[PDB]
Amino acid sequence: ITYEDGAVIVGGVDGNRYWGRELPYKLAKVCWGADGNSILFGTATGEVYVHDASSGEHLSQVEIKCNDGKAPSPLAGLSWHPAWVERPEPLATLAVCYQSGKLQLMTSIGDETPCNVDRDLPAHF
Amino acid sequence: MHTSVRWSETADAVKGIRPPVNSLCYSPSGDYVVASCGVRVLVYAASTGTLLHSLMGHQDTIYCVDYSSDGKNFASGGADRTVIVWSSQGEGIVKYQHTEAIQALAHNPTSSQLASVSSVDWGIWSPEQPKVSKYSLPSKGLCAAWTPNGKTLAIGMLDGTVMMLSKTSEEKVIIRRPAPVWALAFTPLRENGIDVLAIGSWDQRLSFYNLSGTAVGRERELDFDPCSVSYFNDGEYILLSGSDHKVTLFTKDGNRLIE
């Protein structure tokens, strides 16, 4: 359960709060790592980070290239389907989408060759 | 596992003595190679090793060279009582002196700023804050190693004092080694969330110490005195080099596999 101020609360099935934090940046989109040990967050500006499931510290940042970087573009889609977690060559099931409509399909946290395919239309979900 | 030389350079002999290649660095991108010959920093490519840059800014011989995890700026430390911060193209960022000598340069893979290890103490130079606090140490340090997540910094010392002097936690876990600590590194592959530090103690011994100061596994004997610790295939193996005049690859347990 994540808020706009960056506050994150990871609760269990019953309600046992595993850990809560107040991250400094403004969160807008949140995903779950495919393996289940990483949590991907998205800033209001448009940047995406990878944190730990248990400790929650700032593990790394995803290498983005569809984002121009000139202005902070909000993001509209951030989903990582775990169907191929135990796949010898994991498919590009990660998806990062911005409000402009730039879709970037990565295969790992820090994939260097995403299958970024652009569309003219915008995107919301 | 077959090993074959692809390219090899050699520093020119001056007055009959070739200055040592004390340090070596690879870019996180995997292309830039940084070496230090004499008073001069040299830049090569990974594939061919062509001499790209020949920076001459240090007045004396260079001991420590480090590369940032971003792949933009690398800092080289010469024996001229002064640390110089350099850019990829060759522009010095800042040239700040130390008291008597500088020994090591460590870059945190997460945060941008680095930590220098010198005679008086280890200085913390940051791009936002030029002010660096100064404190006393028993003597001059040897090496340094940051955690891959930036948790703790380990200082390798000749008398063996390895201290967990981290800015986040003021608590210190003291390691005692009878031998000099010339090369210590933090594993990038953590199993069960354990922080392990490999120390190449110069009594021909390789030791593993966790963040609790406990000897992980056993102490492994070596046929040399290791002076350069590294990991192979992201924690799969460990690379060692020393007085054997040979490069050896060991398991994470510590057993010898292949020179």
Side-chain angles (χ1 to χ4, degrees), chain B residues 154-189:
Chain B
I155 297 299
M157 188 72 177
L158 210 161
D159 46 66
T161 47
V162 181
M163 40 183 174
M164 311 305 184
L165 254 59
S166 183
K167 53 179 181 178
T168 57
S169 60
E170 302 177 1
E171 301 179 359
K172 316 161 184 177
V173 184
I174 314 177
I175 307 176
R176 192 60 70 257
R177 298 300 304 184
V181 182
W182 205 267
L184 75 174
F186 281 111
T187 167
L189 178 70

Side-chain angles (χ1 to χ4, degrees), chain A residues 1-81:
Chain A
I1 295 94
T2 69
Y3 283 60
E4 257 293 321
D5 67 335
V8 183
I9 291 92
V10 174
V13 186
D14 55 81
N16 46 332
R17 172 168 171 172
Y18 273 62
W19 49 277
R21 289 194 185 189
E22 295 197 13
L23 275 62
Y25 33 87
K26 294 190 175 183
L27 295 175
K29 295 205 60 57
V30 171
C31 179
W32 249 95
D35 66 326
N37 313 290
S38 54
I39 299 186
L40 293 76
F41 289 91
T43 64
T45 63
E47 284 296 330
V48 42
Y49 301 134
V50 174
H51 295 21
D52 181 64
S54 54
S55 59
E57 203 41 67
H58 189 295
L59 259 287
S60 60
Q61 170 174 342
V62 183
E63 179 212 2
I64 204 79
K65 64 185 57 55
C66 76
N67 188 18
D68 53 73
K70 304 178 182 179
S73 303
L75 65 157
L78 179 49
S79 177
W80 195 344
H81 200 270

Side-chain angles (χ1 to χ4, degrees), chain B:
Chain B
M1 173 175 297
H2 308 334
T3 73
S4 182
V5 52
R6 215 178 185 272
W7 60 272
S8 180
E9 299 297 327
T10 293
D12 297 0
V14 179
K15 304 177 182 179
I17 299 179
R18 304 179 184 176
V21 186
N22 289 327
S23 182
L24 185 141
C25 279
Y26 249 105
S27 63
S29 59
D31 168 63
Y32 267 147
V33 173
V34 188
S36 60
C37 297
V39 310
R40 324 182 308 105
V41 195
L42 301 173
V43 178
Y44 310 87
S47 56
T48 319
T50 56
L51 184 52
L52 307 184
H53 299 71
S54 178
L55 313 92
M56 320 162 193
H58 269 302
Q59 306 174 6
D60 301 322
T61 321
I62 308 165
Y63 297 157
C64 47
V65 166
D66 194 13
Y67 207 105
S68 58
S69 55
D70 50 66
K72 285 295 300 176
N73 299 335
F74 48 86
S76 69
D80 50 358
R81 318 207 308 169
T82 300
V83 184
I84 314 178
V85 189
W86 311 78
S87 58
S88 181
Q89 300 84 30
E91 306 94 4
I93 294 183
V94 73
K95 181 182 179 180
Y96 59 100
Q97 69 95 67
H98 268 111
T99 301
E100 294 303 317
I102 66 189
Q103 329 298 137
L105 302 172
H107 283 53
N108 210 21
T110 71
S111 62
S112 67
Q113 80 289 339
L114 68 106
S116 176
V117 182
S118 58
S119 60
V120 42
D121 70 320
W122 60 292
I124 308 100
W125 176 84
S126 51
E128 62 275 0
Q129 181 178 0
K131 179 181 179 180
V132 179
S133 299
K134 301 178 182 179
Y135 290 96
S136 60
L137 274 193
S139 178
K140 312 166 60 182
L142 298 191
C143 187
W146 277 105
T147 338
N149 50 29
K151 167 61 207 61
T152 178
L153 174 67
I155 297 299
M157 188 72 177
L158 210 161
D159 46 66
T161 47
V162 181
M163 40 183 174
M164 311 305 184
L165 254 59
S166 183
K167 53 179 181 178
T168 57
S169 60
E170 302 177 1
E171 301 179 359
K172 316 161 184 177
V173 184
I174 314 177
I175 307 176
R176 192 60 70 257
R177 298 300 304 184
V181 182
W182 205 267
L184 75 174
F186 281 111
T187 167
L189 178 70
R190 299 180 63 180
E191 298 185 359
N192 298 20
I194 303 179
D195 206 21
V196 190
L197 173 77
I199 292 181
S201 63
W202 261 6
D203 49 354
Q204 310 209 64
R205 302 312 286 261
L206 174 62
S207 66
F208 305 103
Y209 277 74
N210 46 39
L211 256 184
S212 59
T214 314
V216 182
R218 299 174 184 177
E219 191 171 1
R220 309 304 178 185
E221 49 86 21
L222 306 179
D223 62 316
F224 51 82
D225 255 7
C227 51
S228 175
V229 289
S230 185
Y231 283 92
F232 209 83
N233 290 149
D234 194 4
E236 164 56 41
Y237 315 110
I238 164 176
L239 249 183
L240 274 190
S241 315
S243 301
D244 199 16
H245 313 162
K246 202 159 302 182
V247 282
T248 51
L249 201 60
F250 304 149
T251 51
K252 54 186 177 181
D253 320 329
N255 308 22
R256 193 194 98 99
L257 297 157
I258 265 180
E259 37 86 21

